[PDB]
Design a protein around this ligand. Structure first.
Ligand SMILES: [Mg+2]
Ligand SMILES: [Mg+2]
Lengths: 740, 740, 482
RNA sequence: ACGGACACAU
RNA sequence: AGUAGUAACAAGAGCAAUGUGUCCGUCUCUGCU
């Protein structure tokens, strides 16, 4: 009842050394004296186990084995022996005693293993009922990123889950801190009701709860899906040259499917506009695309996902549009106006150079969901007017932080205090608009006194909010008011009817241009579930790193066919649909200026004989997959958007993107070998070149018998029969003549 | 035909077969005998690279200290220690300018961590030099001896349990004119061995109280014990490592915590990242460096190491760095963080074991210790040791040698990283305004430096500028271990980048094998190591299946658990054969019970009990996972909790004995501490789960808990009033004893 | 420090610093670099713990005797199959030893094998056995407190190793170790059933890998080393005071699937009170051979070779009567050497992970599994050797066996010379690769790199062979650029 | 949280 | 003698740092087909 431990403490206190230790050691010093060890350290346990298992008794167990396991086997083995001491509570045990217990010990009716290790049985249930597709062989472009190896609880973070575990298992030891969430409280009451009358040790209960509730992450090289059920089978699903198609056993997660529907929508939308019919291609790809081995159009008829590119895929089919987008989890529904996106290089509050994406153009908003409402008048970097509503008085105060992050003026971008790294510890680019969100939730005093005040007229139906938390009726902040009733429901939460056209601009029965394809967010996220665009319009796995390698891999094996199309009737070659998903990597204003340069380079390779570089026709060819312009400008590199970072591709020589390797006789793209082009080096390696400059011929290396040096942009005022020395790029000079 | 493996490098690139250059299947080189020669070598070299500095005698320790700081600038390419304090301050000022708010954020995190760090953080270490014993001890043992000696001498600030009060006691103990410590002495006695009939020496260790002087205590408090690093790959000759005592370790902890907070937020630091995160960071650095370049630019990468990194660093430079990083901070914090460079500027190095001397007439050998080597006549050494002893004699004090320059191996890794990052940070193109600029990444001494320039001579001028700035701050680039090539391939700490990081599987080969804990733990480790190398180190699927088979073969040998139908015979073949014959479902027996191997590629992440659970016999499952398992430890709630683990989770017996050495007198205290910590956990259940905090003694905590537990049990009706009165009177008897 | 402002101090000290502090880039051209300078002296001698290509087995096919599987019972069963014994004579002396002691050791061992009972044969401690096992050779360890009176206390010597010249025997050993035998040496344990298609692909590739890798001679050396180091560790820990006899056993399966137990000779353990990890236990190795040591005498420097018998040898035409020699030496091993010898089967990983990676690299390019093209289409497409006709190209299974033999010989001849040489010559290999990529390599001290390489080439025959291999690869690379 | 193993740098 | 290699073992006290990352866990015998 608790009498035995106080009698034992009396017995120990009657010893003098024990009493001095128990009276002089504090609870903090007990952590030090608990790990006190005065013997020699045991090293090398592998070697020690190798030779200790040759002995008869390598195992030390408690003395109760003398009552549970006999001293003699049926075969005559000795199972345990008493130690060299006399009153030791410890015996030396043979592994034959372990085998005796496993074959002839007491059978128990109560086993605890499927409950304590329920996580691993969940894993085995996911594997056993899983399905295997084929194996495809291609160059896997893995990217090292942080993923979840244990998903944890959705309502908890790791520290909140550890505090829930302490409140459940050891409730009288939690100390000063309380549980600061209602989710913590519901999980705590549920786990306390679940774990009543448990004869398991509390530490094993705590570790079982940590396997259930605590989210663990690791940096792993992932090629495909990144949800926690595709990460446990990462050794099975991917390798260096192969992909095993695997669907785990069981029902998928909802928030995982909601995310990967958006990523698959944006790929099909961005692929479609560089087709000659952007609607007929989007319908051809939506009906064949599958997510976690489930078709797309059956997901697009039951999902409440409110996103811009999802709405193109539904308005093409016929599913009704719930027109809104989501920042922070709230429905940010537009009303009126129109904008367009184009990024820029702006400065932030912590003196860091940031590449933000700001929506330039007027947009009227009705932002409302589940706790409040807001009618945000807003244009270009200007929170003009927001009559914000609510239900409780405090829930308006947190949503006040929500709208003022989305505003992005020249006030909130320079009213940031603290340390807000938009990169991570691996120099990985975090998206900026959600980093100001999680920062201003608790640091809000810089967003209330830098925002200032604006004068208003005493009209009824309007309240106010001050910087210092005062509800007011004379003054308030700039562009933010407070209403009472707000805007009612069943107009944001109605899925309205719309119609689509050939170029995917989505307009309703009145004619509101609700979605244009130019308003699609051109980001490449990594999906939680795999996506099989089983179509002849895409490649095997999408991704900007994969579109680069697979396009050049296809030109290299089809080079015997494509070189003949290049030699005669070349405009049939440029119009290939294999070349079309490569154009999603080029920015929009750069497409016609690159094909006009490239085809002008390609025509000078034809009118000048002997200047046939098959390694440079390959490199420039998927930049001609567009109707050209007549803009006679000079380029030394072509930029390519991959994960936000514009990779350059040099017209002359290797790069980090297109590297030809003379040693292996191969073209290396992004570190992936994409095959030997033709192996025609002896016909190649010429002197005169024609596909580097526009209207100019490189004539060998540098020579100063013609005058000074120029650069690539300063060749505009030249004449006939005039040669020069030009910095061509990558630290070298060539003799260059503007021809006839 | 003579067979040459290296000719495979004709066809395969060297990075794609780099695993054939690591001979990591044989044993690594170990050191035999003493480490005194490598200690003397490093003392001689540290004073050789600084020899043109100033010599002074310390007023407190009496040692000869060499000051190379602001010394004469070097005139050749030898390793130099003449770091210029103004250039170090300029580089740290430039690091603060390029990162505004970095030093203040890192100092604030260190200030918050100083106030909440306990003394027992210092028990996180491995083998620590114990100044009370003049010997290495484990870290918790060394801290307990230091706290015991301090509180015996009247330094009771560390009774609060915070680390900073222990550090105040460390600084206050230097004023003590006579320290009184407890030392381990021995008592020898000539007995006759009973099993070989040879007269041996019985060593019996006891405790003894001695009186240290003030200078002897100060020399011991600045003493770094030294030894040779064993099992080091890649080197022909051995080097020495050092361990500091307990008076240095808390200050070194706080300084390295500040420098870790700085290094986390630097994009050019390779610490504290590692693994996939470090490779992601290096690939991001390569891509950003090619992003911050125009097309008329060469780019070259140095694969760099530094010559004698730890010997050419300086604690006075670290003092200037720490004071400039913490500029504008509280002066207690600047004085606390300055203690570790001041203590490393005045350190001595204990020389080691000494040397083994041999007598050919008497046919004997004796170990002459490091403290007796100053009295040995010089004719008794060999030639290299004679030269070492003669040029170290003016540094020798109390068995140690004075070592004022140099830090030691690994003492300040992050602070040295910050210095290298400051030199890397100098090369931004807006700072330099040259025709060149550089960038890169820097670990402890390894760097990858990317120099961009318009011509190859600008690359040379940039390399010269980087090299000479590094020479100004004491950093010496290794000219024989470094090289330069164009950007696209490099090496960083045995990571090989050939347009992307290749796999180096040989590096992981010492982890494939039987680990030696017990049967279940080794099975888990073996499958997990195979799976982790499938994911990260590109272990192919056929080689992973072969690895599973090789692990199961070595496992079945090691625990003598071959299959139940085998023809082999061991000590446990008969009982495993009985268990095999009596079992209906043989496919559910564990491999440690003669069962079949269940593992293939797909189920490598599932433990063996979970994998076989639906195939076990209910008798075998009830015996194997019996909750009355006599091989594991049972926690008392007599009555104990149920077990969860199987019978294969036994513990192997230990052997902490030393040959001919009785040491019961020094092993009493560990048993008494274990008994006190066992009786504490009867009152505080979560002590083994979370470390309990507290400043009250263990006995007061136990009596308070017993009183409130008896009162809550009497309120809840779970005990009677007589039991409550008996518990309260037992507590009053314990308090009557505790008063005396 | 708190009031410091920079005023161009770095540029002032860079103006003041001498111009002899510079990092001048020397352009690297492998066509103009020199070969590594191999040392001179006497030839390198054999130093493996057992005989590799000269060893002889006495075998029993399908052993069914009593107590089968016990090592001394199998050793008696294998000695029963040889009746051509005679009186042993020293035909090649160990020049630093007492060779009559080795003769008496062999006669004592054979006499005690003839009349042993039990499972473990422990030889009596006679004077020749105490000599050959180094008993009494240590000076008596004393404390210095009772040793100050001793007036001739001289420090232990720390001489460097003496340089040896590369001989041709270690290349012959490496050529023999890359060859297929007529037996399976590695018995791989069972696997779970294949459910995934990738497991079918992996099993199909693993069957090719096992068919090439298990009949190799290096796999026999793996199993020999694993058995020897295992039995030596178990004997060294359980029989610390006995002079135990450990037979050198292996167990193979032939091309017909029949079991076979092979005996290579015996090992007599000394006393093993191993406290450090580098503490040496001494043993005597006595190994059967059909190789006359008087041809390559310098290889057998540490051995006393006896002639103990005659054997009918059936050649391709008819039958001769060859002498049977017994190679006897003292050798020694530590616990870490035994530990790393018991795990030589991970050499099988280091080979195969390389070969599979090559198979996988082509599989990323051809977009299909190229396992059966690599093993069935018998193309010669990897340089693995240098004949007098030039560079010889082998199949991928030959590459399997050559890389396997390289890992096995790294494990057998593991030294600090090897560790230093590999880490230092890796830089020169990467520089040659950077030249062949047209990445314009450059050095800062190439002469210092060469002196860092060549100080690691002292006397180990494997290191001298690897340095000669690097010289041959450099000549091949310079000829490919001719 | 603590411990063990392995890798790398010093 | 031998192992070995800058100093040792060849019995008679067994000397394992710092930093980072990854992985696992929670107290008289020798036989690998
Ligand atoms: Mg270095
Ligand atoms: Mg280094």
């Amino acid at each position: 009842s608790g009498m035995e431990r106080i009698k034992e403490l009396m017995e120990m206190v009657k010893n003098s050394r024990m009493r001095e230790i128990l009276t002089t050691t504090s609870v903090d010093h007990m952590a030090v004296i608990k790990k006190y060890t005065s013997g020699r350290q045991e090293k090398n346990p592998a070697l020690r186990m190798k030779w200790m298992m040759a002995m008869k008794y390598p195992i030390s167990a408690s003395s109760r084995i003398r009552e549970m396991i006999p001293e003699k086997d049926e075969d005559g083995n000795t199972l345990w022996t008493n130690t060299k001491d006399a009153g030791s509570n410890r015996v030396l045990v043979s592994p034959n005693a372990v085998t005796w217990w496993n074959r002839a010990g007491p059978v128990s009716d109560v086993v605890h293993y499927p409950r304590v290790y329920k996580m691993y049985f969940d894993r085995l249930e996911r594997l056993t009922h899983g399905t295997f597709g084929p194996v495809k062989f291609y160059n896997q472009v893995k990217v090292r990123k942080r993923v979840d190896i244990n998903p944890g609880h959705k309502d908890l973070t790791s520290r909140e889950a550890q505090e829930v575990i302490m409140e459940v298992v050891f409730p009288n030891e939690v100390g000063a801190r309380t549980l600061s969430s209602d989710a913590q409280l519901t999980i705590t009451k549920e786990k306390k009701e679940e774990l009543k009358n448990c004869k398991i040790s509390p530490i094993m209960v705590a570790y079982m709860l940590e396997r259930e509730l605590v989210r663990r992450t690791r940096f792993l090289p992932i090629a495909g899906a990144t949800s926690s059920t595709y990460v446990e089978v990462l050794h099975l699903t991917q390798g260096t040259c192969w992909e095993q198609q695997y669907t785990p056993g069981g029902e998928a997660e909802n928030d995982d499917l909601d995310q990967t529907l958006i990523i698959a929508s944006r790929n099909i939308v961005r692929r479609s506009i560089v087709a000659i019919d952007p609607l007929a291609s989007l319908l051809s790809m939506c009906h064949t695309t599958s997510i976690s081995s489930e078709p797309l159009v059956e997901i697009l008829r039951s999902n409440p996902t409110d996103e811009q590119a999802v709405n193109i895929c539904k308005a093409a089919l016929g599913i009704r549009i719930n027109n809104s987008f989501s920042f922070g989890g709230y429905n940010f529904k537009r009303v009126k106006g129109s904008s367009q996106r184009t990024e820029k290089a702006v400065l932030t509050g912590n003196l860091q150079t940031l590449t933000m994406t700001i929506f330039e153009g007027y947009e009227e908003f009705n932002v409302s969901g589940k706790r409040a409402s807001a009618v945000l008048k807003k244009g270009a970097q200007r929170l003009i007017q927001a009559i914000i509503g609510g239900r409780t008085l405090e829930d308006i105060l947190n949503l006040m932080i929500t709208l003022m992050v989305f505003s992005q003026e020249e006030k909130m971008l320079k009213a940031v205090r603290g340390d807000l790294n938009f990169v991570n510890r691996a120099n990985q680019r975090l998206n900026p608009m959600y980093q100001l969100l999680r920062h201003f939730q608790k640091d809000s005093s810089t967003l209330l006194k830098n925002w200032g005040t604006e004068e208003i007229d005493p009209i009824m139906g309007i309240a106010g909010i001050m910087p210092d938390g005062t509800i007011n009726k004379t003054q308030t902040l700039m562009g933010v008011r407070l209403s009472q009733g707000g805007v009612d429901e069943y107009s944001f939460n109605e899925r309205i009817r719309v119609n689509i056209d050939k170029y995917l601009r989505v307009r309703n029965e009145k004619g509101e241009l609700l979605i244009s394809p130019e308003e699609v967010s051109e980001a490449q996220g990594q999906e939680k579930l795999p996506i099989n665009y089983n179509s002849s319009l895409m490649w095997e796995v999408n991704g900007p790193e994969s579109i680069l390698t697979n396009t050049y891999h296809w030109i290299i094996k089809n080079w015997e066919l494509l070189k003949t199309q290049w030699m005669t009737d070349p405009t049939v070659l440029y119009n290939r649909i294999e070349f079309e998903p490569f154009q999603t990597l080029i920015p929009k204003g750069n497409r016609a200026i690159y094909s006009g340069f490239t085809r002008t380079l390609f025509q000078q390779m034809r009118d000048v004989e002997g200047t046939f570089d098959s390694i440079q026709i390959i490199k420039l060819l998927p930049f001609s997959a567009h109707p050209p312009s007549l803009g006679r400008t000079q380029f030394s590199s072509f930029t390519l958007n991959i994960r936000g970072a514009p990779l350059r591709l040099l017209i002359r020589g290797n790069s980090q993107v297109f590297n030809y390797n003379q040693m292996e006789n191969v073209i290396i793209v992004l570190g992936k070998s994409v095959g030997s082009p033709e192996r025609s080096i002896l016909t190649e390696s010429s002197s005169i070149e024609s596909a580097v400059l526009r209207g100019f011929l490189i004539l060998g290396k540098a020579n100063s018998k013609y005058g000074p040096v120029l650069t690539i942009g300063e060749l505009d005022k030249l004449g006939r029969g005039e040669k020069a020395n030009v910095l061509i790029g990558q630290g070298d000079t060539v003799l260059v003549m503007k021809r006839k | 035909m003579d067979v040459n493996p290296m000719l495979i490098f004709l066809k395969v690139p060297v990075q794609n077969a780099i695993s054939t250059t690591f001979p990591y299947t044989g044993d690594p080189p170990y050191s035999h005998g003493t480490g005194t020669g490598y200690t003397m070598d490093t003392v001689i070299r540290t004073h050789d690279y600084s020899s043109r500095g100033i010599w002074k005698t310390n007023s407190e320790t009496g040692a000869q200290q060499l000051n190379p700081i602001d010394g004469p600038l070097p005139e050749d390419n030898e390793p130099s220690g003449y770091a210029q304090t103004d250039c170090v301050l300029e580089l740290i000022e430039g690091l603060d300018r390029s990162h505004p708010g970095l030093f203040e954020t890192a100092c604030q995190e260190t200030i918050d961590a100083i106030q909440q760090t306990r003394v027992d953080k210092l028990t996180q270490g491995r083998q620590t030099y114990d100044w009370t014993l003049n010997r290495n001890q484990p870290a918790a043992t060394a801290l307990a001896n230091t706290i015991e000696v301090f509180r015996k001498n009247g330094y009771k600030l560390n009774e609060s349990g915070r680390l900073i009060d222990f550090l105040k006691d460390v600084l206050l103990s230097f004023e003590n004119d006579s320290m009184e410590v407890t030392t381990h002495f021995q008592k020898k006695k000539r007995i006759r061995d009973n099993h070989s009939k040879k007269m041996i020496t019985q060593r019996t260790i006891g405790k003894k109280r001695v009186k240290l002087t003030k200078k002897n205590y100060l020399i011991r408090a600045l003493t770094l014990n030294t030894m040779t690093k064993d099992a080091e790959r890649g080197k022909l000759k051995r080097r020495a490592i050092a361990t500091p005592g307990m008076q240095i370790r808390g200050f070194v902890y706080f300084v390295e915590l500040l420098a870790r907070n700085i290094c986390e937020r630097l994009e050019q630091s390779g610490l504290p990242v590692g693994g996939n995160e470090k490779k992601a960071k290096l690939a991001n650095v390569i891509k950003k460096m090619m992003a911050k370049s125009t097309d008329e630019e060469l780019s070259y990468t140095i694969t760099g190491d530094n010559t004698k990194w730890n010997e050419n660093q300086n604690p006075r430079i670290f003092l200037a760095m720490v004071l400039r990083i913490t500029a504008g901070q509280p002066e207690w914090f600047r004085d606390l963080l300055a203690v570790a460079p001041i203590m490393f500027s005045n350190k001595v190095a204990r020389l080691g074991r000494g040397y083994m001397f041999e007598s050919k007439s008497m046919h004997l050998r004796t170990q002459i210790s490091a403290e007796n080597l100053s009295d040995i006549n010089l004719r008794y050494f060999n030639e290299d040791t004679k030269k070492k002893i003669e040029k170290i004699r003016h540094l020798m004090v109390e068995g140690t040698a004075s070592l004022s320059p140099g830090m030691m191996m690994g003492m300040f890794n992050m602070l040295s990283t910050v210095l290298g990052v400051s030199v890397l940070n100098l090369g931004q193109r807006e700072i330099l305004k040259r025709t060149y600029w550089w960038d890169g990444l820097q670990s402890s001494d390894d760097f990858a430096l990317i120099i961009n320039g318009h011509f190859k001579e600008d690359i040379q001028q940039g390399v010269n500028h980087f090299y000479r700035t590094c020479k100004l701050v004491g950093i010496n680039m290794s000219q024989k271990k470094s090289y330069i090539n164009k950007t696209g391939t490099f090496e960083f700490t045995s990571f090989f980048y050939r347009y992307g990081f290749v796999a180096n599987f040989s590096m992981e080969l010492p982890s494939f094998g039987v680990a030696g804990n017990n049967e279940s733990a080794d099975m888990s480790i073996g499958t997990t190591v195979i799976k982790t190398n499938m994911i990260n180190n590109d272990l192919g699927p056929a080689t992973a299946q072969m690895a599973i088979q090789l692990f199961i073969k070595d496992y079945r040998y090691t625990y003598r658990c071959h299959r139940g139908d085998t023809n082999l015979e061991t000590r446990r073949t008969k009982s495993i054969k009985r268990l095999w014959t009596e079992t209906i479902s043989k496919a559910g027996l564990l491999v440690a019970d003669g069962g079949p191997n269940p593992y293939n590629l797909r189920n490598l992440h599932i433990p063996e009990v979970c994998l076989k659970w639906s195939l076990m016999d209910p008798d075998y499952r009830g015996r194997l996972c019996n909750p009355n398992n006599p091989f594991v430890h049972h926690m008392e709630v007599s009555l104990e909790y149920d077990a969860v683990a199987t019978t294969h989770s036994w513990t192997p017996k230990r052997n902490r004995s030393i040959l001919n050495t009785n040491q019961r007198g020094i092993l009493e205290d560990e048993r008494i501490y274990q008994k006190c910590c066992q009786v504490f956990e009867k009152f505080f259940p979560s002590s083994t789960y979370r470390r309990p905090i507290g400043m009250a003694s263990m006995l007061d905590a136990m009596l308070s808990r017993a009183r409130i537990d008896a009162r809550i049990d009497l309120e809840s009706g779970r005990i009677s009033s007589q039991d409550f009165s008996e518990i309260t009177n037992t507590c009053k008897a314990i308090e009557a004893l505790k008063r005396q | 420090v708190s009031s410091f402002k920079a005023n161009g101090n770095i540029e002032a000290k860079l103006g003041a610093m001498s111009e002899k502090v510079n990092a001048q880039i020397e352009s690297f051209d492998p066509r103009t670099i020199r070969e590594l300078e191999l040392p001179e002296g006497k030839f390198c001698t054999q130093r493996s713990k057992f005989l590799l290509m000269d060893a002889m087995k006495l075998s029993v096919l399908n052993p069914a005797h009593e107590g089968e599987g016990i090592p001394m019972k199998d050793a008696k069963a294998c000695l029963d199959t040889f009746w051509g014994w005679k009186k042993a004579t020293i035909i090649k002396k160990h020049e630093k030893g007492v060779n009559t002691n080795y003769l008496m050791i062999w006669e004592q061992l054979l006499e005690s094998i003839k009349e042993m009972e039990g499972k473990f044969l422990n030889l009596k401690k006679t004077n020749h056995l105490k000599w050959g096992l180094g008993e009494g050779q240590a000076p008596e360890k004393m404390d210095f407190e009772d040793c100050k009176e001793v007036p001739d206390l001289f420090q232990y010597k720390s001489e460097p190793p003496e340089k040896r010249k590369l001989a041709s025997w270690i290349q012959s050993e490496f050529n023999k170790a890359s060859e297929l035998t007529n037996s399976n040496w590695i018995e791989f344990d069972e696997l779970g059933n294949d459910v995934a298609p990738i497991e079918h692909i992996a099993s199909r590739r693993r069957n090719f890998f096992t068919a090439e890798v298990s009949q190799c001679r290096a796999s026999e050396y793996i199993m020999k080393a694993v058995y020897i180091n295992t039995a030596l560790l178990n004997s060294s820990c359980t029989a610390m005071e006995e002079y135990q006899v450990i037979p050198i056993i292996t167990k193979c399966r032939d091309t017909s699937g029949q079991r076979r137990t092979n005996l290579y000779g015996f090992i007599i353990k000394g006393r093993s009170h191993l406290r450090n990890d580098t503490d040496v236990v001494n043993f005597i190795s006595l190994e059967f051979s059909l190789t006359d040591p008087r041809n390559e005498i310098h290889k057998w420097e540490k051995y006393c070779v006896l002639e103990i018998g005659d054997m009918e040898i059936r050649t391709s035409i008819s039958t001769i009567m060859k002498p049977v020699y017994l190679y006897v030496r003292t050798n020694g091993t530590s616990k870490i050497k035994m530990k790393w010898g018991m795990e030589m089967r991970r050499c099988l990983l280091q080979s195969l992970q390389q070969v599979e990676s090559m198979i996988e690299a082509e599989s990323a390019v051809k977009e299909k599994d190229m396992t059966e093209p690599f093993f069935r289409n018998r193309e010669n497409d990897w340089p693995i050797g240098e004949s007098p006709q030039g560079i010889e190209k082998g199949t991928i299974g030959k590459v399997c066996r050559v890389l396997l033999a390289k890992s096995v010989f790294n494990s057998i001849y593991a030294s600090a010379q090897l560790e230093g040489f590999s880490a230092e010559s890796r830089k020169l290999l990467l520089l040659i690769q950077a030249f062949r990529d047209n990445l314009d390599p450059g050095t800062f001290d190439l002469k210092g790199l060469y002196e860092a390489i060549e100080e690691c080439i002292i006397n180990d025959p494997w290191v001298l062979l690897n340095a000669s291999w690097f010289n041959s690869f450099l000549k091949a690379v310079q000829l490919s650029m001719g």
